[model samples]
Target chain A: DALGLIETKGLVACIEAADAMCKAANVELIGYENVGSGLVTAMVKGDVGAVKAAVDSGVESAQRIGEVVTSLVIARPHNDISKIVA
Target chain B: DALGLIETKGLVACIEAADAMCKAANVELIGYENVGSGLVTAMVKGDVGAVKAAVDSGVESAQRIGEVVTSLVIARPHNDISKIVA
Candidate 1:
């Protein structure tokens, strides 16, 4: 499965990103991570095409109201990295 | 169940708060929240008395190493608010 990570500002903005991502594509909202400093991150899992589409929509939505720290999609996520979500 | 929330700066510091909370009292580390801009929140659930002691220790530990945004303990958190943790 592909993994997508989107980082946005504030609680509301992060939730907005998640909303946009889920609505834009067929992906699963696995969980969210708080990395401190008002930075909220959401994790999504899906096929590579869907993951990319989801993160693009999420990033754009998040940037509309607040900062979008960074967004990435991994085509093939490693097992070690997978532990973060679990 | 009583609920306690401790907010701190950075991912490492927030994890530290969780450690301190679990070690100091009998509480369950439910989850953590990231609300953007260098702020991370960790949640613990336990009895009213245990929640208070755990949060106190968590706040102190978080403050000693880094900035503590806020900390709160709810003796009887409403069902609505409890849904956030679930």
Candidate 2:
């Protein structure tokens, strides 16, 4: 039960589990990626609370649903460019 | 008059030089089609003031150094049209 709740209830439940959040928050579930990934356009608009929520949810979804990585920088952040962030 | 242009300038200089070989005078030193490798862009963008300076310096340096194929895209007179008719 503990593993199930942690795996199923924690992350994805917070960020994406609710279909309403996607519709309400206008969140677009772009596939997914390994941790340390750069911020997608989504982070630009949301607050830190939301970002953590995304990462947590991503990890949760992965643990529960199978196969997922969670972090902030997906692609290399420098030289390769994170200009859009600016 | 100025063969000392691109030789000293950094990127745009090279693009214009290539344009000469390709005979694309209006080749827009905006990008250097280096023998069609992966493609090295020579585009420069910044604040309006900065971009203007780069263009001016690039063009002048090019003109001073040697013959440069220079011509802005002159729109065919749309019943007498001119974006910046020279």
Candidate 3:
């Protein structure tokens, strides 16, 4: 399993990212984290390949709507990090 | 009472903004809203002048730590908006 994260600068962009990510690949939209200062992160989980595709699609869509800070996909993330995301 | 908002990128900057806002004027640190892609807004309340000063100081301090998106100080903000912040 893998985890994907798309960080955007506005709520609209974050929501867009989440929607695109889920629609682009066989990934599950888990939830989002509000890191604040208008920074929202959308999280997803799936196979590594699917996670990567989902994150890329998410970032692309979000960039059209608003600023995208960053994005990542982690295969077999550490348990501690998983705890925080959960 | 007036309401002040300091929007910054990252938790570190937001915390610094909140601290500076509280120290620079006779304002109360109410709470913060995480609009997300790493965007966080620190909320404060006080007299209009105090709020203006506090938001200014907060923005200055936060800019040193991270990017500041924007800021506002509303004298006599509507009850509906106040409810959302509360």
Best by TM-score: 1
1 against 3, candidate with superior TM-score: 1
TM-scores of the candidates in the order shown: 0.53, 0.23, 0.52
DockQ, all candidates in order: 0.15, 0.02, 0.17
Q: Which model, 1 or 3, shows the larger DockQ?
A: 3
Local distance difference test, per candidate?
0.78, 0.29, 0.81
| Candidate 3 interface RMSD value | 9.5
* Reference-based lDDT, residue B6, model 1: 90
**What order do you get sorting by TM-score, best first?**
1, 3, 2
Superposed by TM-score, candidate 1 places the C-alpha of residue A50 at a distance from the truth, in angstroms, of 41
- A-chain TM-score of every model: 0.94, 0.34, 0.95
Residue-wise lDDT of candidate 2 within A1-86, one digit each (tens)? Answer: 00000112233432343332234332344332111112111221233444335445544444455332212312222221223222
Per-residue lDDT tens digits for candidate 1, residues A44-83, read 8899999999999998998899887667676664343354
TM-score of chain B of each: 0.95, 0.35, 0.95
Please tell me which predicted candidate would have the highest lDDT against the true structure. 3
